[PDB]
Design a protein around this ligand. Structure first.
Ligand SMILES: *[C@@H]1O[C@H](CO)[C@@H](O)[C@H](O)[C@H]1NC(C)=O
Ligand SMILES: *[C@@H]1O[C@H](CO)[C@@H](O)[C@H](O)[C@H]1NC(C)=O
Ligand SMILES: *[C@@H]1O[C@H](CO)[C@@H](O)[C@H](O)[C@H]1NC(C)=O
Lengths: 48, 48, 48
C-alpha cells in the first residue's frame, strides 16, 4: 500500500500557534515527504 | 499561481515535465461558536 | 457529531517550461463539489 502523511496535521492539528513555532525545527517534514514519495513511485514500478 | 509554487518547491527556475506535490489545502473556518451553560447568578465567594 | 473540515494534498500537473506554462491541479481525495467556493479570496490561496 502507498500512503502519504501530512506532517502539520499529525503533529499540531488545528492549533494555529503550534504550527508557527513548528517551523523552527527546520525542513524535517520535507525529507519525510520525499522518502514516502519514493516508496509510492516504486510500488508502481514493481507491478510494471 | 500554481506554476510559481512549483518553482519555489523545486528551488529552480525551470520545471521538467511531470506531476509534483506542492502543498496541502484546508477549508477555512466560517465563524466562531461559544456554547456555555445558561445559568446566570453571582457567586458568594466574596464573603470568604 | 464532529467531523473535521475537509483537507488534502495538492499536486500540479505540468509539461516542461520550454513546452508551455499551462498547468493542471489535482486535489487528492476531494470530492469536486467539496472544493471551497472561492469567488475572489476566501482561503489561504494554496495553489489557486
Ligand atoms: C436554560 O435552558 C433550559 C433548557 O434545558 C430552560 O429550561 C431554562 O429556562 C433556561 N434558562 C435560561 C435562563 O435560559
Ligand atoms: C470586601 O470589602 C472591600 C472593602 O473593605 C471591598 O472593596 C470588596 O469589594 C469586598 N469584597 C466583596 C464585596 O466581595
Ligand atoms: C460528490 O458530490 C456530492 C458530495 O456529497 C455527492 O452528491 C456525490 O454523490 C459525490 N460523489 C462521489 C463519487 O463522491
Amino acid at each position: 500500500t502507498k500512503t502519504s502523511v501530512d506532517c502539520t496535521m499529525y503533529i499540531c492539528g488545528d492549533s494555529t500557534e503550534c504550527s508557527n513555532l513548528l517551523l523552527q525545527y527546520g525542513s524535517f517534514c520535507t525529507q519525510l515527504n520525499r522518502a514516502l514519495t519514493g516508496i509510492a513511485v516504486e510500488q508502481d514500478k514493481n507491478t510494471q | 499561481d500554481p506554476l510559481s509554487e512549483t518553482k519555489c518547491t523545486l528551488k529552480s527556475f525551470t520545471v521538467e515535465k511531470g506531476i509534483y506535490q506542492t502543498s496541502n489545502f484546508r477549508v477555512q473556518p466560517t465563524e466562531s461558536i461559544v456554547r456555555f451553560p445558561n445559568i446566570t447568578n453571582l457567586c458568594p465567594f466574596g464573603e470568604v | 457529531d464532529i467531523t473535521p473540515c475537509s483537507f488534502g494534498g495538492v499536486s500540479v500537473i505540468t509539461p516542461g517550461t520550454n513546452t508551455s506554462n499551462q498547468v493542471a491541479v489535482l486535489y487528492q481525495d476531494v470530492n469536486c463539489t467539496e472544493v471551497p467556493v472561492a469567488i475572489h479570496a476566501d482561503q489561504l490561496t494554496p495553489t489557486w
